[PDB]
Amino acid sequence: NSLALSLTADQMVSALLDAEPPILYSEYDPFSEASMMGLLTNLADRELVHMINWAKRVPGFVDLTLHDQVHLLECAWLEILMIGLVWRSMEHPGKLLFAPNLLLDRNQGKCVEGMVEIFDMLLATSSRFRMMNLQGEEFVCLKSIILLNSGVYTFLTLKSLEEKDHIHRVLDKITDTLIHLMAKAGLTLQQQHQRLAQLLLILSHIRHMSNKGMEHLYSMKCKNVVPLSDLLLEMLDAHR
Amino acid sequence: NSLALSLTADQMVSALLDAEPPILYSEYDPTRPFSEASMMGLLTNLADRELVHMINWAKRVPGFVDLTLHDQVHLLECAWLEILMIGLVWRSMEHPGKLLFAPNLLLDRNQGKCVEGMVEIFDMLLATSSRFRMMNLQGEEFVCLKSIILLNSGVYTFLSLEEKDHIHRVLDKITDTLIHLMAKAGLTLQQQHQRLAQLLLILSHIRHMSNKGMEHLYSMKCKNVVPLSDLLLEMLDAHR
Amino acid sequence: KILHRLLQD
Amino acid sequence: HKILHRLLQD
Numbered sequence: 001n002s003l004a005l006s007l008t009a010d011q012m013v014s015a016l017l018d019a020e021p022p023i024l025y026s027e028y029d030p031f032s033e034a035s036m037m038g039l040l041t042n043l044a045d046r047e048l049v050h051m052i053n054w055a056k057r058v059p060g061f062v063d064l065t066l067h068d069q070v071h072l073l074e075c076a077w078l079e080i081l082m083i084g085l086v087w088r089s090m091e092h093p094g095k096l097l098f099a100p101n102l103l104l105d106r107n108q109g110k111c112v113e114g115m116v117e118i119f120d121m122l123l124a125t126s127s128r129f130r131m132m133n134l135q136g137e138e139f140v141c142l143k144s145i146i147l148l149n150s151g152v153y154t155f156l157t158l159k160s161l162e163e164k165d166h167i168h169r170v171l172d173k174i175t176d177t178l179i180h181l182m183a184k185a186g187l188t189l190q191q192q193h194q195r196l197a198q199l200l201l202i203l204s205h206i207r208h209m210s211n212k213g214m215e216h217l218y219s220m221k222c223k224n225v226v227p228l229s230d231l232l233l234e235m236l237d238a239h240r
Numbered sequence: 241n242s243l244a245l246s247l248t249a250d251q252m253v254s255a256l257l258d259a260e261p262p263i264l265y266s267e268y269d270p271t272r273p274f275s276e277a278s279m280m281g282l283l284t285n286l287a288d289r290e291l292v293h294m295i296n297w298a299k300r301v302p303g304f305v306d307l308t309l310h311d312q313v314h315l316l317e318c319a320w321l322e323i324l325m326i327g328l329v330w331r332s333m334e335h336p337g338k339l340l341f342a343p344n345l346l347l348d349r350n351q352g353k354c355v356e357g358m359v360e361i362f363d364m365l366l367a368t369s370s371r372f373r374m375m376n377l378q379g380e381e382f383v384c385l386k387s388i389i390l391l392n393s394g395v396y397t398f399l400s401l402e403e404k405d406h407i408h409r410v411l412d413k414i415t416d417t418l419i420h421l422m423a424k425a426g427l428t429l430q431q432q433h434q435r436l437a438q439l440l441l442i443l444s445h446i447r448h449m450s451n452k453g454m455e456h457l458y459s460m461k462c463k464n465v466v467p468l469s470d471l472l473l474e475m476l477d478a479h480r
Numbered sequence: 481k482i483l484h485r486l487l488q489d
Numbered sequence: 490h491k492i493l494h495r496l497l498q499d
């Protein structure tokens with residue numbers, strides 16, 4: 001009754017490669033701050049509905065109760081949007097590729113009050129990825145951990161406990177997958193453990209930025225500079 | 241330099257163990273009523289005094305003293321409440337339901353409710369503690385985690401390309417140490433990496449907590465409930 | 481909730 | 490002049 005448990009290391013990476021969302025486009029065409037944050041938020045709102053299908057399609061995820069999936073996702077959403085974007089802008093130093101036709105310089109983030117600090121952390125982060133030459137089959141593992149790890153200790157019975165351990169079970173499988181990949185690329189044990197860590201230690205950075213981007217996002221809605229979708233509202237209100 | 245880099249795993253955990261700061265006590269006087277302002281004042285008092293020992297511990301962490309003051313200041317500014325918080329969780333480990341701030345300050349769920357906003361963070365802090373107990377955290381595992389939180393948490397917001405990777409080179413050492421400890425406890429190569437990942441995945445929850453508490457802390461300063469050590473003011477002001 | 485709907489759909 | 494800056498050489 002848990003056959004995400006009976007996946008092979010490669011049926012996994014191929015399952016996750018298979019779920020990958022499409023790369024959405026900006027409908028962008030003077031740059032206002034409400035103009036561009038209009039842009040980034042209608043982009044993110046589109047992004048979110050694709051993310052939900054890709055969530056359903058992360059092995060082990062639909063085994064979870066509906067209320068548990070909800071929370072994992074309102075806890076994990078902006079993190080996921082960022083790691084995706086950071087992967088996107090990997091082969092674009094200095095620039096953030098939100099959409100194929102919306103590649104913002106680390107300077108155009110000045111166009112929204114205090115947006116630039118966040119730009120920079122994202123920029124720092126992809127610069128990290130780039131420099132450790134992160135692979136695409138790792139990225140999808142990273143991306144799956146994030147959805148599963150982010151909201152799992154905010155659970156709070158006997159049955160709700162087995163969920164935690166279920167999802168901890170799959171999380172240990174995604175570790176085995178990550179490490180299989182590194183064995184395969186010919187990394188010594190030591191290089192394996194050490195890089196495993198490197199990858200997992202940046203996920204805290206991602207979480208930092210998510211936290212920080214969520215209070216910017218919130219201060220933005222409050223002085224009403226651009227209208228948020230309804231889903232986007234919900235995603236935000238859940239953090240507060 | 242290499243003092244840090246030319247370390248045995250065991251020389252490593254030895255050095256970390258004795259750098260440990262002392263468990264301080266609370267200025268808690270029980271023959272008085274518990275306020276939001278009283279207990280916020282107690283905690284911040286306690287905290288302020290704990291930062292000064294932390295700063296000595298930091299300098300006693302291999303690699304650390306090799307950074308210039310801007311980097312030491314930045315690491316310590318970005319990581320401080322996380323280190324305070326991971327210590328607190330260790331402390332109240334074998335006190336389920338409770339958080340041992342000081343041996344004479346042991347709080348529980350309801351007691352957090354005495355000040356507004358506080359209880360959500362109590363709740364998570366408590367959960368993090370339960371998870372350390374479930375996972376049977378060792379003290380040699382804890383001091384290493386603490387050292388990782390120091391070095392890693394600010395690393396991506398200063399970059400200095402060559403300070404960058406010597407921080408990275410120490411952080412590697414620590415995962416080596418950490419693993420060597422898991423080997424020695426008699427954990428199988430697959431438990432070794434499985435648990436390495438469990439530990440490092442919590443650090444993300446700890447970054448999530450630090451950020452929330454930093455946000456709460458900032459609220460108290462803005463609702464004027466307690467005065468804050470000029471030093472704490474500088475710590476919060478490093479965040480925005 | 482919107483997300484709730486979106487999950488079952 | 491930062492309190493933390495001085496504390497770190499104190």
Ligand SMILES: C[C@]12CC[C@@H]3c4ccc(O)cc4CC[C@H]3[C@@H]1C[C@@H](O)C2=O
Pocket residue numbers: 040041043044047081082085098118212213214216217220
């Ligand atoms: C939500 C956001 C505006 C939209 C951004 C965004 C938009 C689209 C996308 O694919 C990824 C991201 C990553 C960060 C997101 C920003 C972070 C936060 O500062 C904000 O207001």
Ligand SMILES: C[C@]12CC[C@@H]3c4ccc(O)cc4CC[C@H]3[C@@H]1C[C@@H](O)C2=O
Pocket residue numbers: 283284286287290321324325327328341358361452453454456457460
């Ligand atoms: C910063 C803090 C006041 C002091 C608390 C504190 C104080 C001492 C300590 O060792 C650990 C902690 C963990 C949470 C800390 C609180 C979280 C935040 O809500 C707050 O006001």
